[PDB]
Amino acid sequence: MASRILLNNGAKMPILGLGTWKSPPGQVTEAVKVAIDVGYRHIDCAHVYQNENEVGVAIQEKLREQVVKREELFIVSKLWCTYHEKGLVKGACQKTLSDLKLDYLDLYLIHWPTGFKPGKEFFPLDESGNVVPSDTNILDTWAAMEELVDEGLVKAIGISNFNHLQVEMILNKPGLKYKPAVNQIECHPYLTQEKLIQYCQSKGIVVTAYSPLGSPDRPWAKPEDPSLLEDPRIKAIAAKHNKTTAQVLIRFPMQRNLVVIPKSVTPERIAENFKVFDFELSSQDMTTLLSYNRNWRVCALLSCTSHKDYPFHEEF
Numbered sequence: 496m497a498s499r500i501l502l503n504n505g506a507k508m509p510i511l512g513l514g515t516w517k518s519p520p521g522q523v524t525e526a527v528k529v530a531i532d533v534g535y536r537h538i539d540c541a542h543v544y545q546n547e548n549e550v551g552v553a554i555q556e557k558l559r560e561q562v563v564k565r566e567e568l569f570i571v572s573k574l575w576c577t578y579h580e581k582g583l584v585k586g587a588c589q590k591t592l593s594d595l596k597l598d599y600l601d602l603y604l605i606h607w608p609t610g611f612k613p614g615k616e617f618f619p620l621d622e623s624g625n626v627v628p629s630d631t632n633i634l635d636t637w638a639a640m641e642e643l644v645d646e647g648l649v650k651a652i653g654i655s656n657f658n659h660l661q662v663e664m665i666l667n668k669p670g671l672k673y674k675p676a677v678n679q680i681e682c683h684p685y686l687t688q689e690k691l692i693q694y695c696q697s698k699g700i701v702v703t704a705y706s707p708l709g710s711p712d713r714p715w716a717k718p719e720d721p722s723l724l725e726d727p728r729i730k731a732i733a734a735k736h737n738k739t740t741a742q743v744l745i746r747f748p749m750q751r752n753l754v755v756i757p758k759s760v761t762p763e764r765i766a767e768n769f770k771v772f773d774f775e776l777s778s779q780d781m782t783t784l785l786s787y788n789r790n791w792r793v794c795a796l797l798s799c800t801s802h803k804d805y806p807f808h809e810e811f
């Protein structure tokens with residue numbers, strides 16, 4: 496298993512990265528330091544995660560320690576929904592760069608296809624709890640992303656949580672300057688994404704799997720919800736390989752030619768999660784894990800189901 500996948504800009508992206516959603520600012524600096532120490536070279540960030548300064552501290556420290564140089568790192572961030580207006584995109588990118596203490600990003604994603612009213616609140620609500628949309632559209636936001644590449648702020652651009660029709664809208668745009676390099680989507684044994692993966696891979700778009708462990712720390716979880724890490728069937732596959740369930744869950748997308756970004760702030764788990772290059776899931780293991788699909792999403796963006804660009808009405 497080669498550790499990187501080639502993107503459309505000629506750069507190579509590490510297939511295993513560290514996720515940072517819900518990594519509290521008071522804990523994420525150490526997590527990123529440990530991750531770099533044990534070999535992670537790809538960090539998945541976002542402005543909305545409210546912790547980019549603390550990620551940036553860790554990166555700066557490890558650069559000053561001579562542990563890594565910048566060119567060996569693959570830093571991803573994402574344009575939040577309240578910044579989809581063309582005139583806000585550059586400032587949002589530059590805020591992320593300033594917080595991360597970087598002079599470029601390796602990859603910058605449109606975080607969701609839905610634009611929200613601009614302003615200080617990340618999820619602006621009306622008096623009845625509906626998300627307030629903005630008068631923005633995918634193609635104009637994409638054109639603003641393209642400018643970031645032309646100005647050297649970012650090396651590649653991509654999308655996240657786009658359905659195939661939304662991807663196609665960019666691909667077919669008259670005057671397209673850059674194709675999206677990546678679509679980052681939820682993917683795990685309960686939401687296997689067979690059709691959207693087939694679509695993206697056939698169009699030369701690399702897929703990154705988010706919430707590979709089923710996001711047990713997500714803030715809307717219900718106790719009756721399915722739990723991947725506790726699934727006794729996956730535990731049995733893991734035992735057979737002398738690996739943990741988490742390690743099986745990370746290796747699974749790697750063998751589908753996906754990038755995967757498990758999150759932890761716990762040092763032992765950060766190291767555990769990287770130790771996935773020393774075993775192989777069998778054909779039968781892959782087939783069995785795929786067979787657990789239930790089309791079950793942990794990140795369904797439920798406050799946005801009436802937004803014109805809500806991505807999850809389409810089958811894929």
Ligand SMILES: NC(=O)c1ccc[n+]([C@@H]2O[C@H](COP(=O)([O-])OP(=O)(O)OC[C@H]3O[C@@H](n4cnc5c(N)ncnc54)[C@H](OP(=O)(O)O)[C@@H]3O)[C@@H](O)[C@H]2O)c1
Pocket residue numbers: 513514515516517539540606655656679680704705706707708709710711712724739741742756757758759760761764765767768794
């Ligand atoms: N583009 C998007 O819209 C989007 C949406 C969701 C996620 N993401 C990205 O994908 C990343 C990963 O997804 P996620 O954060 O939702 O969840 P996840 O990676 O599926 O699961 C993270 C949870 O699993 C725990 N954990 C980690 N390693 C473990 C292990 N070896 N054994 C047991 N438990 C373990 C973590 O606990 P501790 O941290 O306490 O150790 C945390 O509670 C995010 O952090 C973010 O970077 C992107």
Ligand SMILES: CC1=Nc2c(-c3ccc(Cl)cc3)nc3ccc(F)cc3c2[C@@H](O)N1CC(=O)O
Pocket residue numbers: 516541543544545606618714715794796797798
């Ligand atoms: C899937 C997702 N949902 C939200 C939400 C959210 C919670 C519930 C609902 Cl119905 C919709 C969105 N809240 C967040 C609060 C703080 C923060 F830092 C991030 C919050 C996020 C967000 O970061 N997250 C992850 C993502 O979009 O990558």
